[PDB]
Subunit: 325 residues, 4 copies
Amino acid sequence: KLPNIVILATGGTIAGSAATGTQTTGYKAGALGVDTLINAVPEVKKLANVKGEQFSNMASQNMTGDVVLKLSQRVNELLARDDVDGVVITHGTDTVEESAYFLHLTVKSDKPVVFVAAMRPATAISADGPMNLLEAVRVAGDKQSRGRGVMVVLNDRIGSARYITKTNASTLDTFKANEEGYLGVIIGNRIYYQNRIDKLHTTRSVFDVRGLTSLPKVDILYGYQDDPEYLYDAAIQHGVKGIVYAGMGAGSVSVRGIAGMRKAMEKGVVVIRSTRTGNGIVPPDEELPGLVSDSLNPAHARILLMLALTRTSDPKVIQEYFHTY
Amino acid sequence: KLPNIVILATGGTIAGSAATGTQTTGYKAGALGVDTLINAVPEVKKLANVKGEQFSNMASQNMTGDVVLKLSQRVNELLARDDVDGVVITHGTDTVEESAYFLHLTVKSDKPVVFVAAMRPATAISADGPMNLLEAVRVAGDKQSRGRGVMVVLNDRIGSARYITKTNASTLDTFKANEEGYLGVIIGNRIYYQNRIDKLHTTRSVFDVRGLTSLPKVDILYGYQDDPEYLYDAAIQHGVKGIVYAGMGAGSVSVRGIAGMRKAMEKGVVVIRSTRTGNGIVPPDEELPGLVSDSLNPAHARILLMLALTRTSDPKVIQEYFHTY
Amino acid sequence: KLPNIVILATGGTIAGSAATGTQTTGYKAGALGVDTLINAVPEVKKLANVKGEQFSNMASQNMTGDVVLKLSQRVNELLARDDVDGVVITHGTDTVEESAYFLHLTVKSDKPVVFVAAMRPATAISADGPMNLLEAVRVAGDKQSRGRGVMVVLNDRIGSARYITKTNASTLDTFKANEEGYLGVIIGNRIYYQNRIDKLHTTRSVFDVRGLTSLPKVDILYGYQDDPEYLYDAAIQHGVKGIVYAGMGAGSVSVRGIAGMRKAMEKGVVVIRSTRTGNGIVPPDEELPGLVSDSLNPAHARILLMLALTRTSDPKVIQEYFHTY
Amino acid sequence: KLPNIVILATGGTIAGSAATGTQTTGYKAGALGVDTLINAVPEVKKLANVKGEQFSNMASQNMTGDVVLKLSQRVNELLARDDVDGVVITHGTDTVEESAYFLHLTVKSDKPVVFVAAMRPATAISADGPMNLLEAVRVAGDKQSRGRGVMVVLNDRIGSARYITKTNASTLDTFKANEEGYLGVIIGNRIYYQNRIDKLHTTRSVFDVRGLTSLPKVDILYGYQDDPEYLYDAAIQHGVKGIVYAGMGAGSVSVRGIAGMRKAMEKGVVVIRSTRTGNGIVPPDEELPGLVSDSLNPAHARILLMLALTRTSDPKVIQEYFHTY
Ligand SMILES: N[C@@H](CC(=O)O)C(=O)O
Ligand SMILES: N[C@@H](CC(=O)O)C(=O)O
Ligand SMILES: N[C@@H](CC(=O)O)C(=O)O
Ligand SMILES: N[C@@H](CC(=O)O)C(=O)O
């Protein structure tokens, strides 16, 4: 027996199709159907019995928490089946780290869930999607891949959903985790596992969203010279339950940001101080408002905070989640 | 014999002083005076005739465009003097890239301007500031350092103001330019120059702010799943002239972001699409609203846009500035 | 209350002492005694009951396998004691990755073994050794540090012995593992664990060298354009049991290298093909002579091969060790 | 209208051809002819009038200094012609940095010379060579590419021959210059120049090898724990004129290495201390034997030393070359 893998498609440049091979604008991300991706790499059938299912077909900049919630619920159904050994999810690069991390916290199975994406459309010269998809299927079907949390596979690398991020606007090697590295790499049709993440996920995670149809509102505000108080006022006004702050340095806040945060907290908004820098630890500091994001970047921090707020409003518990998830 | 260097102090953790050597919260950034920094490294007097001038003493997260404008005007006065060979500017790490890039565009001299900072306070065990300051002074006093644009010096590295960024919340090696590298390095008391930036700066820059007392209002908004339209409404409402968008991937915009941007542009707000990723090129795309940031990250892009708006409101000219500065 | 930590000193720039603070040549690495290091950071005594033991005092470029063997044997004696909770080993940066990886494979305890080093001498301005030592002691005394394999601590980072390497000749942030990241980081006097290495080590390792008094001879030969066959001849002639080849690219071998390798193997020399590149996988290739190093760089590969050859001469078993250690 | 570009083919995995699309051993590097590469990307004809010339067809691990000398001589002939605007050289990845740097020092023209390579064979799924070639042709034909020294183009990046190196055995993104960055990047069919190298090359280089038919013999020896003296004896015995030492840390030498080096120097062998670390400066140290490689890695250092020895045996002049080329 080959493993049985479902390829659950959501869209992205991996399913993008353009007029010529050199073209990288004007084409639609999420134009091609899941079977077209599979038929472009017939080699996948030597690795697994694959079945394509079209979940959606959108550019990932339009992916929304309400859709991601349904994606999570669907993956959980699929993995509950005896005839499904793993799932590969095709997705746009722009917000794959948000969807992936969401599933990392909410999927109740040790079976592999592997997000895969492409920086060049399927019609491009030296398109990356075909090899990226092959590698994702190899990963999803290996018995050694079980219990590792949700994975993001591109460019011969296996990244943990919790650490991996799109570090570059436009390159093929954009997905990196500068301080945490890759869980593994795929070279010469062989998987080499290097690390296991030392964080809670999947079957050891408290978060369960089955039955939910929507999520708490969380917005992200940037920190910079002359950052304005009025954006905190606007967020509070629009009923946010959480604000993630993409702070200067180690979550440092200006006098204007401190004023906005204190206002937010008066209204019961939970504030998380993250960093705009790209990497590293925002340490605890009792003198400043809000909780701290540990090493979660702003986009990951929003996902965790949303999920946390489905369960609790207790700052002590939420802070512990940030240190452990 | 020796070069004459002014050390112009603005604050920062480099001037921070705590109760113990292991302490890194509760202490005040910008507590120590410039002469206390100089007297902690008397070795600097073998490199240069140094003179300390206290420009300000704040944490850099509170640095503002109006103050940076005065800093630029002061540096231009200093460099106009025959008895000043270069300037070293002590500053906080959190927004040094913004202040540095501002001076990179507005300083009308080939004499060296070198920003220097520290991630650990002056009282810390293995504090970095002493050696960082020594290196900055060596750089500022070398004849080979002339004509290179504004520099940021920490941890044995010389970064261009246009490329360097704080990449990590909390580490000593935080300042990197992943795609562009360092202008040079300082090893064994010797400067090794590697690159010259291929962009316009200082004496070849069209931007001149002498006589200005304030700058156009420019805000930065983040891109993420479920990003809200109402933050664009708030910005427009508060009279911004420019919005920098810290976009998903290559400046990709959601349907909500597109609606906010189109509204902004109807009111004459100039929109620049940058990236939240940390690195790389946002390419032109005539199908999407706004201009593109080229390789300027959101913080640098705000600075350039502010300065551009002091000279023009022509999108074609502003776009050209983003490709040349 | 506090853990009991032995600080076992071997030398290195961490123990180096120069005539001035800016000096970085002419000084002797491994000049200062272990108690002088401890007394320079009295803060260590709030973290642990420390005891210094002078094992040696040499520059690490002179460290030899016979000495490393004794170091391993000693650490195993120390860790067998009820009154020792962990060991910190002060060492030179140049070959710390070789000594650390040796201990990683031979130390029969889950108690922490933490190597520490410094790129600047103890007398330098902004010397890194004091903070590095303090961090190493924090790591060695934490209960959470147990069972993680041997660690190398510098510059706020905790590297696994198996992955970490000196990547730069002269910088403070030199120790990195580009593909595998750090096991953890130490920020704000707090340890943040990120990864557990997915390889065999310490208490799950087959390698045991207690009672040995010497090791098999293994040399390292470089791969490059016009590489010569006569260096393989010289190695065979001097009785090597193993050759690690620091190959072009993915362990690629010239016609001359193939000839040298075939000669070596005819004499029963075990050949491992590694890479000079710095990073990544050398994949299996039945067409080429020798075994492959997986992701072990040449220095690590020499250590593993030496240890392997104390137990077996079976190529199949040795190759498996390279994929699992 | 279009620039005239010669594509001069030497072999490599870019010209490699395998039995299936997933295969990466058993195939021959340098199997396909230059016209087959060109015809696989007919899009190149919109960028340039291209002409293929087959210089050789070998795996680059077999490239030799005598062949590289001919390659340089041929490129100089081509660039002397009015009907040649630039040259793209197809080559294997394993030693492209050595051949590229050789040309960087010996090519007497400001016209672009661009080396290009591929990590996956031409028959692979998601092969990189087609896009890499197209980018190389774009770079070679752009007027803005003149006067930049020799370039290595892969994966959307333009590296200087002096800084770029294969950092990873097996990945597509392997070519990096960690401290010096890229000269530029190619994104969205547009070239973005970031840096100019601050070193002597091409038209400003003293090295001229036209008329030479062979080069001085230079070998490379590795530095590691227990490194043997007898390899220096072997090298001396075989008539080397130079030895490059791939040293521990900053060119640090063991007692055994010092003895070998002193022996070599007595026989008039020039010794250059480089580093095995991958990056950074080997600083001067008059106490230790030999000259220092500045930031040249061992493979580059061999190239420069060979060329230096064609002109001089004066240590002072050779050392100055290492600081300026
Ligand atoms: N805009 C695309 C970008 C990509 O997939 O590369 C997406 O995220 O759907
Ligand atoms: N908040 C401090 C951080 C530092 O300087 O390291 C500042 O930017 O002033
Ligand atoms: N030569 C020194 C270098 C250092 O420790 O930084 C050593 O390895 O002992
Ligand atoms: N063996 C090949 C490797 C490659 O081109 O990727 C070469 O250097 O010729």
